[PDB]
Amino acid sequence: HLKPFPPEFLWGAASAAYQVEGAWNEDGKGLSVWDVFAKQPGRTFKGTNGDVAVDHYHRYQEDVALMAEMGLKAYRFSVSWSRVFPDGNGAVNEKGLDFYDRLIEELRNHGIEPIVTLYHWDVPQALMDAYGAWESRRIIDDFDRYAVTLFQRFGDRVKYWVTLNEQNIFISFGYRLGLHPPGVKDMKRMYEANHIANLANAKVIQSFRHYVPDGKIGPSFAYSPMYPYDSRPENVLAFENAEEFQNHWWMDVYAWGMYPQAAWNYLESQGLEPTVAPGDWELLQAAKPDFMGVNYYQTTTVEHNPPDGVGEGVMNTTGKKGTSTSSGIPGLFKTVRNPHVDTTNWDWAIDPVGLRIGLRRIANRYQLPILITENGLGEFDTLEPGDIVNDDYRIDYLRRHVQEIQRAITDGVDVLGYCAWSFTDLLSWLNGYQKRYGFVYVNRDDESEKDLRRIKKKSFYWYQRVIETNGAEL
Amino acid sequence: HLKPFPPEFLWGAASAAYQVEGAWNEDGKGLSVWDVFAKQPGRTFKGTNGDVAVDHYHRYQEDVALMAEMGLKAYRFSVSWSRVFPDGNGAVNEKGLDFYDRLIEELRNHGIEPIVTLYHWDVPQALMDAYGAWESRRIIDDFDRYAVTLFQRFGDRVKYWVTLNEQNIFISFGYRLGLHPPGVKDMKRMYEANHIANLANAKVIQSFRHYVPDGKIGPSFAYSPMYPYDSRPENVLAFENAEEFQNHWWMDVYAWGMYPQAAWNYLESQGLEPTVAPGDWELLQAAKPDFMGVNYYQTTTVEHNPPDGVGEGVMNTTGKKGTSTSSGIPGLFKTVRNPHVDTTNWDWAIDPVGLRIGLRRIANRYQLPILITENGLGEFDTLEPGDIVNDDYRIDYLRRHVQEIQRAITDGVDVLGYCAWSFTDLLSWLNGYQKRYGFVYVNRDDESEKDLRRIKKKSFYWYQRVIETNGAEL
Numbered sequence: 001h002l003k004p005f006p007p008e009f010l011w012g013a014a015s016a017a018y019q020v021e022g023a024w025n026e027d028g029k030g031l032s033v034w035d036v037f038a039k040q041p042g043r044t045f046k047g048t049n050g051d052v053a054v055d056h057y058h059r060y061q062e063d064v065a066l067m068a069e070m071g072l073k074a075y076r077f078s079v080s081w082s083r084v085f086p087d088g089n090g091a092v093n094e095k096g097l098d099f100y101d102r103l104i105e106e107l108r109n110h111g112i113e114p115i116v117t118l119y120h121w122d123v124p125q126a127l128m129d130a131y132g133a134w135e136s137r138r139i140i141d142d143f144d145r146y147a148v149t150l151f152q153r154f155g156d157r158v159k160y161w162v163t164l165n166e167q168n169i170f171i172s173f174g175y176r177l178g179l180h181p182p183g184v185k186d187m188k189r190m191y192e193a194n195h196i197a198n199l200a201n202a203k204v205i206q207s208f209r210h211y212v213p214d215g216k217i218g219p220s221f222a223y224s225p226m227y228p229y230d231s232r233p234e235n236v237l238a239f240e241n242a243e244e245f246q247n248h249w250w251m252d253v254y255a256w257g258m259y260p261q262a263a264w265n266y267l268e269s270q271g272l273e274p275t276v277a278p279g280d281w282e283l284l285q286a287a288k289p290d291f292m293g294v295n296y297y298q299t300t301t302v303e304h305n306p307p308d309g310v311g312e313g314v315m316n317t318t319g320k321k322g323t324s325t326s327s328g329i330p331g332l333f334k335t336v337r338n339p340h341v342d343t344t345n346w347d348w349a350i351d352p353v354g355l356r357i358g359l360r361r362i363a364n365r366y367q368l369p370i371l372i373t374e375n376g377l378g379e380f381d382t383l384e385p386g387d388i389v390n391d392d393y394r395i396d397y398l399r400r401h402v403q404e405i406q407r408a409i410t411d412g413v414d415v416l417g418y419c420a421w422s423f424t425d426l427l428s429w430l431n432g433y434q435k436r437y438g439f440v441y442v443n444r445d446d447e448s449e450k451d452l453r454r455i456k457k458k459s460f461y462w463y464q465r466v467i468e469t470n471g472a473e474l
Numbered sequence: 475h476l477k478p479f480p481p482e483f484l485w486g487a488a489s490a491a492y493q494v495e496g497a498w499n500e501d502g503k504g505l506s507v508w509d510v511f512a513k514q515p516g517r518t519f520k521g522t523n524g525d526v527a528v529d530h531y532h533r534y535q536e537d538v539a540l541m542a543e544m545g546l547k548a549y550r551f552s553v554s555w556s557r558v559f560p561d562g563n564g565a566v567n568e569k570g571l572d573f574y575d576r577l578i579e580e581l582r583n584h585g586i587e588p589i590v591t592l593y594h595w596d597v598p599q600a601l602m603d604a605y606g607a608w609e610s611r612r613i614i615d616d617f618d619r620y621a622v623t624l625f626q627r628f629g630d631r632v633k634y635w636v637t638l639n640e641q642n643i644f645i646s647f648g649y650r651l652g653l654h655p656p657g658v659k660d661m662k663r664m665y666e667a668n669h670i671a672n673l674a675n676a677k678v679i680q681s682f683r684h685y686v687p688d689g690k691i692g693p694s695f696a697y698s699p700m701y702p703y704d705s706r707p708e709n710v711l712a713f714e715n716a717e718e719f720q721n722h723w724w725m726d727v728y729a730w731g732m733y734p735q736a737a738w739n740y741l742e743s744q745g746l747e748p749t750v751a752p753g754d755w756e757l758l759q760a761a762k763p764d765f766m767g768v769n770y771y772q773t774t775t776v777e778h779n780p781p782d783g784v785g786e787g788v789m790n791t792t793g794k795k796g797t798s799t800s801s802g803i804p805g806l807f808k809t810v811r812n813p814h815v816d817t818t819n820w821d822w823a824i825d826p827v828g829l830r831i832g833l834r835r836i837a838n839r840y841q842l843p844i845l846i847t848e849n850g851l852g853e854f855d856t857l858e859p860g861d862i863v864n865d866d867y868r869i870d871y872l873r874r875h876v877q878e879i880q881r882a883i884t885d886g887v888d889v890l891g892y893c894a895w896s897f898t899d900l901l902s903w904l905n906g907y908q909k910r911y912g913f914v915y916v917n918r919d920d921e922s923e924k925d926l927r928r929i930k931k932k933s934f935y936w937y938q939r940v941i942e943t944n945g946a947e948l
């Protein structure tokens with residue numbers, strides 16, 4: 001007795017501006033931190049960058065026609081802040097706004113609901129140069145000016161908005177792991193920037209209530225639900241520590257305005273806790289979102305880890321399977337291979353039931369509606385003769401996730417929509433172009449732009465049918 | 475470096491009226507449901523009952539002097555509703571109150587803080603005869619009237635109160651498993667009674683805020699933290715179901731005034747959900763407790779359970795190790811042996827790290843102070859020539875738990891106190907006299923009443939030292 005999907009369930013697909021747009025220095029666009037970082041030697045796969053990406057800035061009309069052919073109910077994209085404020089906080093670049101205005105009109109003219117991500121990792125380099133971007137409280141007012149600019153321009157036409165895409169990733173990768181800009185590896189700096197980002201999220205949610213009173217807004221969290229390895233009490237405890245440090249650290253702030261205490265105490269015991277100003281807690285507690293945005297791709301299995309144990313692990317950026325290694329926080333937990341699930345060529349776990357679990361944990365802890373803002377399978381694809389791509393592996397992945405979503409809905413989770421990552425193939429920040437997620441193949445690779453032609457994959461036709469039957473036929 | 479136990483930490487021990495008092499028909503006392511139930515053949519181990527028990531009603535001066543010798547900071551006990559209102563709701567029986575007043579006096583005179591439990595499973599049989607007791611909303615006003623009598627009479631000498639002792643257990647055993655009065659096996663009646671107990675709890679918490687404004691009050695929940703057996707997604711999901719169904723079903727209502735949605739929907743799907751009435755929600759939501767009382771003995775490991783798999787299992791009431799079998803809810807989860815822990819002769823898991831896990835979950839989800847209202851080890855004891863009871867097994871159990879408590883406190887959990895189960899040996903409801911938990915041995919068994927003389931066990935002195943050092947020495 002499964003519930004159906006709701007009559008107006010937002011069947012979607014997603015992109016991010018740096019990964020798709022190209023036109024990195026056209027029509028007055030300023031440099032973003034990713035324009036600079038990606039052109040540093042050694043930072044990205046084979047030196048790939050988003051100078052051209054898949055040229056969505058020029059080809060958006062074609063891409064939207066293909067969305068309309070698919071029957072997409074919603075398209076999630078991000079706004080490139082450096083297109084709108086070339087120097088982050090100066091005068092507005094109207095040509096930048098005009099691009100998003102053309103895109104939104106194009107979507108609406110085809111009956112597609114826009115879902116706008118304010119921030120998908122691309123703070124203008126000028127703010128980084130001026131004051132260190134996310135490490136300065138100055139960014140709170142600067143992010144707010146940019147958000148309000150969009151809210152006033154587009155608020156009439158866009159109802160669904162995402163504030164920060166994966167704060168947990170951009171902050172940890174940028175300031176702990178050194179793998180995203182600004183390339184820092186300093187845990188204290190990381191938790192300071194994170195706190196500032198929390199304040200920026202809250203502040204724009206408050207502004208949103210004034211400028212878009214009939215809208216819906218939330219953050220999109222990169223959620224990997226944690227599992228203990230087995231029922232050994234020390235492994236279950238490792239699991240409580242992981243869930244709290246990796247997940248509650250962010251989601252409790254978004255939902256409740258408070259950091260979890262056992263994590264806080266652990267950080268305070270090392271002088272790593274953020275610097276909290278008077279007024280911070282009041283702001284964080286007075287910015288309730290309409291939904292938790294959830295980016296889900298995999299679960300993580302953890303076990304105990306002694307004080308001299310595993311810290312940073314190797315991440316697979318090449319698509320050679322079995323190249324990842326364990327990571328952790330010495331004393332608290334380490335990741336371990338889950339022997340009950342398959343993995344992708346990039347060593348990501350395939351765990352559709354984990355999505356059902358993550359959705360239940362969120363509903364159960366926070367009582368919040370959930371918009372799944374990303375989910376998808378990143379894999380090698382082959383273009384075959386006759387412009388055919390048979391990505392059965394992708395269909396299988398998506399079908400099983402969408403079935404668990406329906407089970408979560410039947411369990412009583414309020415899921416607003418589902419945005420598959422990604423609509424067209426695009427640039428993977430650290431994995432290049434060969435790690436493909438699209439319904440629509442783009443003809444290019446790491447060595448050549450080729451002709452950038454769009455080619456519908458088998459999954460395109462699978463999803464068109466899912467959407468036509470409102471999820472009744474998977 | 476661990477945090478120290480705080481300076482005014484309540485180092486306690488506990489009992490319950492039916493299990494300790496005897497004097498079942500003296501001084502005006504009415505029949506309770508347990509007076510009747512225990513006399514029915516087959517309901518108790520070797521037909522044991524509490525007509526005499528360990529005769530605490532006559533020997534309380536001796537017992538309180540033994541508590542003073544130990545150094546106890548607090549003693550948790552229950553009031554026998556049937557001593558105070560022999561009819562449940564008639565005229566108050568002053569001789570009944572007088573005993574509790576004498577007991578409270580003796581406690582205060584020796585410096586010991588009393589913790590009073592309002593309800594420990596012994597509703598007057600008159601109420602059950604009159605209107606089915608917990609199955610009728612009339613018990614809400616009757617219970618409240620009894621609590622208000624006690625608040626008024628003792629509010630100025632008793633600061634800490636527990637409302638219902640293990641609602642989850644007396645409701646479940648009495649209305650689903652048929653092991654406690656009223657001896658019913660009917661899920662529908664179970665949830666209706668449970669819902670009424672919920673409202674009764676909230677009602678008296680509200681009364682308390684008028685009558686004892688400077689006091690602290692909470693329910694005491696029987697908490698077995700759940701573990702998944704392993705990282706199979708289906709087992710983790712079975713763990714989410716078990717924690718929600720066994721634990722959040724109660725704690726969410728105590729803390730937030732709401733039932734969890736997935737358990738609700740699943741019950742609704744079967745017609746098993748409780749009859750809600752206008753005002754119920756407003757009442758449940760307007761009755762925050764000061765703390766969560768936790769009674770803890772063991773964790774439970776679960777795994778996936780087919781729609782046609784395990785339901786009721788064998789429970790060990792004889793102390794013959796290895797006679798318990800798995801229990802489950804078909805389709806949701808079933809219990810399974812945790813290979814990483816030892817068990818007692820009654821097949822209870824020994825899992826002190828489980829306690830820190832549980833305290834951590836409660837603090838993380840509800841942010842409430844915790845009073846550990848029971849914890850202890852039930853085993854066979856041997857009396858030795860010389861009045862020696864070498865209960866090392868018990869010392870080791872309690873040492874480990876107390877150590878995980880200090881770890882939780884350090885992790886940041888606010889534990890107000892710890893009350894070991896039990897001060898003297900006493901009657902176990904279903905297991906008889908041979909299942910002993912006391913620091914003070916009581917000379918009787920399931921065959922012979924002998925003389926009921928109190929002998930200090932090795933653990934008595936152990937705990938004496940613990941209290942002497944405020945935890946510093948174990």
Ligand SMILES: O=P(O)(O)OC[C@H]1O[C@@H](O)[C@H](O)[C@@H](O)[C@H]1O
Pocket residue numbers: 016019165166169222295374378421427428429430431435
């Ligand atoms: O590109 P990857 O590393 O395979 O990850 C896939 C996706 O990850 C999400 O975490 C990001 O929001 C996306 O921009 C995209 O990168």
Ligand SMILES: O=P(O)(O)OC[C@H]1O[C@@H](O)[C@H](O)[C@@H](O)[C@H]1O
Pocket residue numbers: 490493639640696769848852895901902903904905909
């Ligand atoms: O007596 P047992 O079955 O060994 O249980 C030990 C304890 O269970 C607790 O939860 C009950 O509140 C106590 O009254 C005592 O019965």
